Homo-oligomer: 127 residues x 3
């Protein structure tokens, strides 16, 4: 197994790595909507969902996989009242990559790192 | 890898599939207590826990596995004060299937889809 | 696949096992900061984080692996305001084991079993 490290997702400053490549299975850390170019977080929940998904994509692609290889996500949100918006963005993201939708779990948590509105972790497979 | 799709669990309307069959490992989406026959959610927390477990079972069985093949679950609840009840139902469900209990994580979240009281995701293996 | 059962982590009284050994992959149950020798929970959040990590370590080691084989954790906390402290302890724990940091997801939940401040689940691999 090996660490996945890419400039295309926010740098792993704390005691974690961006993701792990286990051979057939890749697992990402929970991605928050931090822009890897600027370090900023967009205000808009739809934009946050998209930034988190782009961060997941960067890690999966750094391991040689595609968005279409993602088979399971967990989506942690700060407010389920914004879920229609998140769902629309999430759906669009997968559609843009001609990807079958992953299996998913979705819950509203009390708070997320940096007070973001969403955090998404993903599992992808080579086969 | 392939999608698991069964009439025996609530249809996957949003941007997700019910579960994924990765070869040896099967992963389900987080199941909420929606009845696949009627679309209704039972009021009772014990009944909700059982409906979620039945939904997990439907997906695992659609992949050719048994409840006894489930090795890890995550149980998200709306209120840990109802956990004795949930635990009793969960225990009964596994016992009914002559199944070794899976590894498990349990947390109280702020809110769940459709305001349900429980959501359960599961991992099962063929070997 | 087989159950992992060790006297070195709190006994699995409810309907769960401490962890599962799936061959290459080991998955633990969500560990809470209960001391396996006394059954008590330390007051201090740093001490709680360390007790949870020690419990994870006991299960991983019972399967023949090391802390350095842990590749993904999920850390559920009661209060993200205590996260700097948790992070410091978590970092120290991995460093003490000369371990590459795992991938990680971190969220604040509404409540945890026994009103603890942290629960940590982990995935480790042999290869």
């Amino acid at each position: 197994s090996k660490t996945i490290a890419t400039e295309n997702a926010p740098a792993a400053i704390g005691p974690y790595v961006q993701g792990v490549d286990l051979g057939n299975m890749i697992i990402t850390s929970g991605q928050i909507p931090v822009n890897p170019k600027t370090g900023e977080v967009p205000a808009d929940v739809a934009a946050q969902a998209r930034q988190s998904l782009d961060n997941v994509k960067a890690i999966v692609e750094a391991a040689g996989l595609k968005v279409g290889d993602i088979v399971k996500t967990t989506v942690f949100v700060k407010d389920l009242n914004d879920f229609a918006t998140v769902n629309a963005t999430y759906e669009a993201f997968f559609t843009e990559h001609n990807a079958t939708f992953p299996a998913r779990s979705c819950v509203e948590v009390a708070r997320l790192p940096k007070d973001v509105k969403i955090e998404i972790e993903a599992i992808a497979v080579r086969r």
